Write an enzyme that holds these catalytic residues in place. Structure first.
Site, PDB file in Angstrom:
ATOM      1  N   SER A   1       4.629  -2.175  11.489  1.00 11.72           N
ATOM      2  CA  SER A   1       4.449  -3.081  10.360  1.00 11.72           C
ATOM      3  C   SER A   1       2.991  -3.531  10.327  1.00 11.72           C
ATOM      4  CB  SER A   1       5.336  -4.310  10.523  1.00 11.72           C
ATOM      5  OG  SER A   1       5.005  -5.301   9.568  1.00 11.72           O
ATOM      6  N   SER A   2       2.349  -3.452   9.162  1.00 10.48           N
ATOM      7  CA  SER A   2       0.961  -3.895   9.037  1.00 10.48           C
ATOM      8  C   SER A   2       1.026  -5.388   8.746  1.00 10.48           C
ATOM      9  CB  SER A   2       0.245  -3.157   7.889  1.00 10.48           C
ATOM     10  OG  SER A   2       0.523  -3.728   6.622  1.00 10.48           O
TER      11      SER A   2
ATOM     12  N   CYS B   1       0.711  -1.285   0.000  1.00  9.33           N
ATOM     13  CA  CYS B   1       0.000   0.000   0.000  1.00  9.33           C
ATOM     14  C   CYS B   1       0.732   1.323   0.000  1.00  9.33           C
ATOM     15  CB  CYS B   1      -1.082   0.015   1.111  1.00  9.33           C
ATOM     16  SG  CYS B   1      -0.755   0.916   2.658  1.00  9.33           S
TER      17      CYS B   1
ATOM     18  N   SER C   1      -7.050   0.065   5.088  1.00 14.47           N
ATOM     19  CA  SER C   1      -6.417   0.306   3.796  1.00 14.47           C
ATOM     20  C   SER C   1      -5.178   1.218   3.725  1.00 14.47           C
ATOM     21  CB  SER C   1      -7.491   0.788   2.807  1.00 14.47           C
ATOM     22  OG  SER C   1      -8.020   2.031   3.204  1.00 14.47           O
TER      23      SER C   1
HETATM   24  N1  LIG Z   1      -5.733  -4.385   3.441  1.00 10.07           N
HETATM   25  C1  LIG Z   1      -5.655  -3.799   2.235  1.00 10.07           C
HETATM   26  N2  LIG Z   1      -5.304  -2.508   2.067  1.00 10.07           N
HETATM   27  C2  LIG Z   1      -5.302  -1.897   0.829  1.00 10.07           C
HETATM   28  C3  LIG Z   1      -5.681  -2.634  -0.338  1.00 10.07           C
HETATM   29  C4  LIG Z   1      -6.056  -4.029  -0.164  1.00 10.07           C
HETATM   30  O1  LIG Z   1      -6.259  -4.808  -1.098  1.00 10.07           O
HETATM   31  N3  LIG Z   1      -6.028  -4.570   1.142  1.00 10.07           N
HETATM   32  N4  LIG Z   1      -5.678  -2.000  -1.586  1.00 10.07           N
HETATM   33  C5  LIG Z   1      -5.073  -0.641  -1.659  1.00 10.07           C
HETATM   34  C6  LIG Z   1      -5.817  -0.006  -2.841  1.00 10.07           C
HETATM   35  S1  LIG Z   1      -5.326  -0.401  -4.459  1.00 10.07           S
HETATM   36  C7  LIG Z   1      -6.870   0.942  -2.677  1.00 10.07           C
HETATM   37  S2  LIG Z   1      -7.646   1.588  -4.139  1.00 10.07           S
HETATM   38  C8  LIG Z   1      -7.252   1.399  -1.265  1.00 10.07           C
HETATM   39  C9  LIG Z   1      -8.766   1.554  -1.107  1.00 10.07           C
HETATM   40  O2  LIG Z   1      -9.045   2.387  -0.013  1.00 10.07           O
HETATM   41  P1  LIG Z   1     -10.521   2.602   0.531  1.00 10.07           P
HETATM   42  O3  LIG Z   1     -11.180   3.347  -0.564  1.00 10.07           O
HETATM   43  O4  LIG Z   1     -10.350   3.259   1.841  1.00 10.07           O
HETATM   44  O5  LIG Z   1     -11.151   1.157   0.774  1.00 10.07           O
HETATM   45  P2  LIG Z   1     -12.468   0.580   0.052  1.00 10.07           P
HETATM   46  O6  LIG Z   1     -12.868  -0.576   0.882  1.00 10.07           O
HETATM   47  O7  LIG Z   1     -12.195   0.366  -1.382  1.00 10.07           O
HETATM   48  O8  LIG Z   1     -13.634   1.676   0.128  1.00 10.07           O
HETATM   49  C10 LIG Z   1     -13.649   2.688   1.127  1.00 10.07           C
HETATM   50  C11 LIG Z   1     -15.057   2.864   1.706  1.00 10.07           C
HETATM   51  O9  LIG Z   1     -15.990   3.428   0.752  1.00 10.07           O
HETATM   52  C12 LIG Z   1     -17.281   3.224   1.292  1.00 10.07           C
HETATM   53  N5  LIG Z   1     -18.299   3.582   0.300  1.00 10.07           N
HETATM   54  C13 LIG Z   1     -18.983   2.743  -0.554  1.00 10.07           C
HETATM   55  N6  LIG Z   1     -19.813   3.379  -1.342  1.00 10.07           N
HETATM   56  C14 LIG Z   1     -19.681   4.710  -0.980  1.00 10.07           C
HETATM   57  C15 LIG Z   1     -20.336   5.867  -1.472  1.00 10.07           C
HETATM   58  O10 LIG Z   1     -21.197   5.955  -2.365  1.00 10.07           O
HETATM   59  N7  LIG Z   1     -19.897   7.015  -0.819  1.00 10.07           N
HETATM   60  C16 LIG Z   1     -18.955   7.047   0.189  1.00 10.07           C
HETATM   61  N8  LIG Z   1     -18.648   8.260   0.679  1.00 10.07           N
HETATM   62  N9  LIG Z   1     -18.359   5.979   0.669  1.00 10.07           N
HETATM   63  C17 LIG Z   1     -18.756   4.852   0.040  1.00 10.07           C
HETATM   64  C18 LIG Z   1     -17.224   1.757   1.698  1.00 10.07           C
HETATM   65  O11 LIG Z   1     -18.226   1.475   2.656  1.00 10.07           O
HETATM   66  C19 LIG Z   1     -15.774   1.619   2.226  1.00 10.07           C
HETATM   67  O12 LIG Z   1     -15.722   1.595   3.651  1.00 10.07           O
HETATM   68  O13 LIG Z   1      -6.701   0.548  -0.240  1.00 10.07           O
HETATM   69  C20 LIG Z   1      -5.296   0.183  -0.401  1.00 10.07           C
HETATM   70  N10 LIG Z   1      -4.853  -0.614   0.738  1.00 10.07           N
HETATM   71  S1  F3S Z   2       2.931   0.125   3.576  1.00  7.62           S
HETATM   72 FE1  F3S Z   2       2.869  -1.873   3.964  1.00  7.62          FE
HETATM   73  S2  F3S Z   2       0.439  -2.502   3.503  1.00  7.62           S
HETATM   74 FE2  F3S Z   2       2.854  -0.272   5.603  1.00  7.62          FE
HETATM   75  S3  F3S Z   2       0.507   0.262   6.083  1.00  7.62           S
HETATM   76 FE3  F3S Z   2       0.592  -0.326   3.925  1.00  7.62          FE
HETATM   77  S4  F3S Z   2       3.335  -2.168   6.059  1.00  7.62           S
END
Ligand SMILES: Nc1nc2c(c(=O)[nH]1)N[C@H]1C(S)=C(S)[C@@H](COP(=O)(O)OP(=O)(O)OC[C@H]3O[C@@H](n4cnc5c(=O)[nH]c(N)nc54)[C@H](O)[C@@H]3O)O[C@H]1N2
Ligand code: F3S
Ligand SMILES: Nc1nc2c(c(=O)[nH]1)N[C@H]1C(S)=C(S)[C@@H](COP(=O)(O)OP(=O)(O)OC[C@H]3O[C@@H](n4cnc5c(=O)[nH]c(N)nc54)[C@H](O)[C@@H]3O)O[C@H]1N2
Ligand code: FES
Ligand SMILES: [Mo+4]
Ligand SMILES: [O]
EC number: 1.20.9.1
Lengths: 820, 128
Positions: free
Chosen positions: A93-94, A19, A233
């Site tokens: 560390s995550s 991430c 995330s």
């Molecule tokens: N553990 C973990 N972490 C990651 C990733 C992963 O695969 N796993 N992927 C990385 C990547 S590529 C990305 S793009 C990010 C994503 O980061 P985030 O966008 O924070 O995570 P998401 O779960 O995609 O969606 C965020 C929130 O949007 C809300 N939501 C849904 N519909 C709507 C709406 O219409 N309006 C609003 N305001 N909220 C809404 C959902 O309920 C959800 O809680 O995370 C990154 N980090």
């Molecule tokens: S950087 Fe990696 S999935 Fe950092 S919080 Fe994202 S240990």
């Protein structure tokens, strides 16, 4: 048991592969069977293992170690642990980065299925082949297509991000090959179906989406998290910067920086239809009274911000001198986005009192005279929301009027997904093309998925998979019919098949993946540590991840696979006597990934260099691997302002601090934000089906689970994508934890194991996206905004019980993931 | 590993954890009679389990939540399921909570810690 590294163990810097946060780590490498001593000076960790270590002294577990086998046959112990001195993570560390050692390649570990050589589908299965053979077929097809159909016959879906599977070297390599050499406009990005941006509106308004520092989160009076679930995330950004602010640990920094100013206890506001683990933890830390969860109606963000905007304007809680001198279009926006709090509440479902509270905490002048410092963070909730372009237009108008960009402690920024690392030639087309549809309609001779798996992540993914699998079966039958043909004859046979509906499919990945179901050829790539790689994080902090081991078999860096393709094409044309065609494929004479770094990132904006679009900008040449290595895991925040032997690389903490924006006249530009309700395509499913099909991230699972699918603990925890459902809805459907349900609408069908969650609102659900067993994307629609940005979060469907899976009930915990 | 007697099953109150150290005084653990059988649980009702209370993420001591039968870590909010052999429900750890193996002697009704599944925090091996 764990093997300690000798005090002299080789140590290299490693940014987390995953991430946006880009947490700093160290990698220790030393011969297997050699062990460091327990006395502190006797091990590279400088920790006292003679007696129990105290709490918080270290993050070290067996999963954070491994034994790799180098090409020379020598076995080495490796240990990948977080760097306590990195200011990003402060040693944190995550759970995802913590597994880096377990996911590094080894012939017996979680990564034993990595691609170690080019693979070819033959005799109805996969067999290893050589790079020469692979290039003969691959360059052969691209050559025939170019000579007969031109560039439009070549299709790509490629990463454009940073971190592992991306990076300034890898994006330049693929971009130069795709855009400059091949010149094909038929390219989409890994997470979006066209060659576009997730931030067209904010950029056009003058505000690039990564305009502050992670420290600004520590200095904020108030933090908004819009369509974002940060604890899961962007874990360590939330944990090392956000929480310390809420806990009161950053007050001295505020005091030092801002004189004659009150600092109320920090407060946090979430704009999310769903109550997430982030909300729960924020309440656990700051208390309910300091957290505002605006649980809006799905897709109503634009109405929310227009209402807040109208309100702060009516109340006078705006920075008038700033609006007057550094913005354009304020009066027009006041008119076009006018919406009363009662109208706003009606549309969003958010109580009027809460709307007023949110505005009071965030924009009403503090007792000392200054407007609060409010950082607005947003991610996929609105980026993949109801009209990407309009929501940002609405949100930024609010931010701009309240001067919440350019002031320390503020900023309106993406929280990011992957890290960033973009350096590329300009896109070679004038129109936005929805690639998935073109392929479904049968366009293209050859398609190459590079560092992505759209079979699990495209919107309306079931339609794509069915189409690709059909077009691929055609080429398969032809190839099988021509068994015994020469490579040259096979290229002709394949090309003919594509003239009869077929599609030749290539995957350049670390693993086979679901794409192996349709692919004819797969090329082995290398991730960070098996190569050097540069990328920046959410505050534009670029770092160098150092190579410390060999890639599996003949796998190689993506930028180098790109050069290998380009040189094979150049050579094929030379042998065909076509000098001009051979010439357009020159320029990839690279031996290491560092050569790509020099060719793209460092040449950006320099005399005699081609047109280059780089996040490093025109001072990127000041950066070198040696200077980055010397900068450690803290690296430098882009853009680099200068370099000298004494101070090293000097950067920029926050953008727009002088009120000058990235626009023609230097002012931030307000935009109209019309509230149109849900899109017809989405509204139609909503009118026809019962549940809102929310979807997204799970803390422990990383993306398409390419590594996770091989991890025993992950397999036992999430043997199938899960769907969070309200308990009343579960009772009505007669399902409990571990039961399998089918989810469906007019776009497709999918399935998931039921996860009863009291916090889920009735009529709503949340399903793990992009998984290996249960693909949520199959029920997402084909609707996209004006720039072709999908509303991945806007879909509705019905849910029916399929059956029970005793094994799921035996091994899977269905206890609450909301802390407290 | 040593054979450290933890207690007699009869003395374990329903869902009331009992502290003890294993495999040494620097390794704090807890035993608990869950009340309802679970795989790996011992005792007359196969519901007695035991764990190291230190979070393997960064060593913070975890607390037992009787209502959910889970161990919560206050440092980075990781939660472990006491009914699923320490499986991590949500969190930043990369392993289950170390589980203490208990031998239950029907004759003496005694519970003896005789081993550990997983690696306790802050040490190169379980036995220092
Ligand atoms: N553990 C973990 N972490 C990651 C990733 C992963 O695969 N796993 N992927 C990385 C990547 S590529 C990305 S793009 C990010 C994503 O980061 P985030 O966008 O924070 O995570 P998401 O779960 O995609 O969606 C965020 C929130 O949007 C809300 N939501 C849904 N519909 C709507 C709406 O219409 N309006 C609003 N305001 N909220 C809404 C959902 O309920 C959800 O809680 O995370 C990154 N980090
Ligand atoms: S950087 Fe990696 S999935 Fe950092 S919080 Fe994202 S240990
Ligand atoms: N319903 C729904 N769909 C979504 C989303 C959602 O919120 N909801 N989110 C969208 C978003 S935000 C994203 S980020 C996309 C992600 O879509 P994808 O990009 O398709 O998913 P990833 O798992 O990130 O793909 C990475 C792939 O590259 C491979 N890989 C890893 N490292 C390397 C490397 O060094 N080189 C090469 N060549 N390959 C490598 C991995 O094995 C894996 O196959 O999904 C999108 N689709
Ligand atoms: S020390 Fe337990 S969650 Fe980090
Ligand atoms: Mo993403
Ligand atoms: O993303």
């Amino acid at each position: 048991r764990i093997t300690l590294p000798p005090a002299n163990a080789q140590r290299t810097n490693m940014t987390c592969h995953f991430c946006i946060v880009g947490c700093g780590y160290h990698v220790y490498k030393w011969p297997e069977l050699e062990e460091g001593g327990r006395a502190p000076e006797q091990n590279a960790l400088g920790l006292d293992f003679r007696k129990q270590l105290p709490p918080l002294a270290s993050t070290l577990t067996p999963a954070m170690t491994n034994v790799v086998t180098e090409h020379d046959g020598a076995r080495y112990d490796i240990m990948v642990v977080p760097d306590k001195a990195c200011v990003v993570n402060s040693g944190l560390s995550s759970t995802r980065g913590g597994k880096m050692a377990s996911y590094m390649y080894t012939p017996t570990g979680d990564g034993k299925e990595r691609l170690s050589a080019p693979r070819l589908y033959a005799a109805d299965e996969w067999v290893d082949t050589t790079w020469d053979h692979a290039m003969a077929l691959y360059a052969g097809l691209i050559k025939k297509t170019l000579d007969s159909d031109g560039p439009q016959g070549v299709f790509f879906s490629c990463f454009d991000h940073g971190g592992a599977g991306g990076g300034f070297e890898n994006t330049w390599g693929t971009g130069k090959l795709m855009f400059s050499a091949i010149q094909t406009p038929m390219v989409r990005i890994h997470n979006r179906p066209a060659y576009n941006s997730e931030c067209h509106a904010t950029r056009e308004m003058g505000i690039g989406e990564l305009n502050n520092a992670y420290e600004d989160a520590q200095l904020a009076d108030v933090i908004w998290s819009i369509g974002n679930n940060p604890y899961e995330s962007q874990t360590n950004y939330f944990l090392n910067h956000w929480l310390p602010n809420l806990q009161g640990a950053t007050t001295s920094k505020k005091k030092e920086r801002f004189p004659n100013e009150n600092f109320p206890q920090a407060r946090i506001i979430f704009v999310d239809p769903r109550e997430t683990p982030s909300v729960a933890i924020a309440r656990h830390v700051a208390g309910n009274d300091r957290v505002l969860h605006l649980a809006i109606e799905p897709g109503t963000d634009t109405a929310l911000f227009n209402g807040l905007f109208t309100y702060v304007v009516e109340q006078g809680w705006i920075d008038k001198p700033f609006i007057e001198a550094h913005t354009k279009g304020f009066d027009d926006a006041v008119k076009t986005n006018r919406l009363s709090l009662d109208e706003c509440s009606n549309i969003t479902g958010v109580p009027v009192d809460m709307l007023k509270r949110a505005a009071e905490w965030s924009y009403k002048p503090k007792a000392s005279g200054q407007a609060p410092r409010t950082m607005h963070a947003y991610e996929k909730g609105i980026i993949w929301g109801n009209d990407n372009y309009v929501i940002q237009s609405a949100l930024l108008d609010l931010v701009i009027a309240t001067h919440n960009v350019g002031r320390r402690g503020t900023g309106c920024v993406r929280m990011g997904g992957h890290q960033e690392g973009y350096t590329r030639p300009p896109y070679p087309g004038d129109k936005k093309i929805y690639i998935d549809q073109e392929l479904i309609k049968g366009k293209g001779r050859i398609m190459t998925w590079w560092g992505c798996n759209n079979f699990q992540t495209s919107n309306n993914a079931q339609a794509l998979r069915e189409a690709i699998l059909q077009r691929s079966a055609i080429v398969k039958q032809a190839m099988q019919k021509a068994r015994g043909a020469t490579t040259e004859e096979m290229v002709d046979v394949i090309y003919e098949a594509t003239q009869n509906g077929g599609l030749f499919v290539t995957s350049i990945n670390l693993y086979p993946t679901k794409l192996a179901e349709a692919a004819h050829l797969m090329l082995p790539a290398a991730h960070p540590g098996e190569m050097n790689l540069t990328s920046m994080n959410g505050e534009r902090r670029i770092r160098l991840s150092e190579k410390f081991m060999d890639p599996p078999g003949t796998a190689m860096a993506d930028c180098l696979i790109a050069a290998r393709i380009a040189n094979a094409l150049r050579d094929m044309y030379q042998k065909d006597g076509k000098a001009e065609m051979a010439a357009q494929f020159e320029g990839f004479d690279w031996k290491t990934e560092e050569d790509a770094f020099n060719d793209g990132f460092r040449r950006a904006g320099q005399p005699g260099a081609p047109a280059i679009d780089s996040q490093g900008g025109s001072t990127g040449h000041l950066v070198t691997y040696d200077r980055l290595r010397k900068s450690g895991n803290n690296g430098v925040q882009l853009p680099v302002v200068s370099w000298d032997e004494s101070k090293g690389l000097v950067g920029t903490e926050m953008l727009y601090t002088e009120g000058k924006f990235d626009t023609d006249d230097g002012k931030a530009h307000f935009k109209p934000a019309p509230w149109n309700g849900l899109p017809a395509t989405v509204q139609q499913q909503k009118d026809k089906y019962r549940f809102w099909l929310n979807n997204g991230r799970n803390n422990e699972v990383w993306q398409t689970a390419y590594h996770d699918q091989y991890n025993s603990l992950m397999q036992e925890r999430y043997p199938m994508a899960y769907i969070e459902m309200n308990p009343d809805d579960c009772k009505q459907l007669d399902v409990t934890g571990g039961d399998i349900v089918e989810v469906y609408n007019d776009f497709g069908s999918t399935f998931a194991m039921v996860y009863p969650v009291a916090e889920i609102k009735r009529g709503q659900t949340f399903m793990l996206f992009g998984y290996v067993n249960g693909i949520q994307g199959d029920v997402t629609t084909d609707w996209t905004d004006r720039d072709i940005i999908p509303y991945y979060k806007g879909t509705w469907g019905d849910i029916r019980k399929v059956g029970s899976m005793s094994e799921f009930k035996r091994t899977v915990s269905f206890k609450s993931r909301r802390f407290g | 590993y040593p054979a450290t007697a933890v207690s007699v099953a009869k003395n374990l109150a329903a869902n009331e954890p009992s502290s003890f150290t294993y495999p040494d005084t620097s390794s704090p653990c807890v035993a608990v009679k869950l009340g309802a059988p679970v795989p790996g649980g011992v005792g007359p009702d196969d519901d007695i389990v035991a764990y190291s209370v230190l979070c393997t993420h960064m060593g913070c001591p975890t607390s037992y939540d009787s209502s959910s039968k889970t161990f919560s870590c206050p440092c980075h909010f990781t939660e472990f399921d006491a009914e699923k052999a320490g499986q991590m429900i949500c969190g930043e750890a990369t392993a289950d909570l170390p589980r203490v193996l208990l031998r239950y002697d029907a004759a003496s009704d005694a519970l003896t810690a005789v081993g550990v599944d997983g690696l306790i925090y802050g040490r190169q091996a379980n036995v220092i």
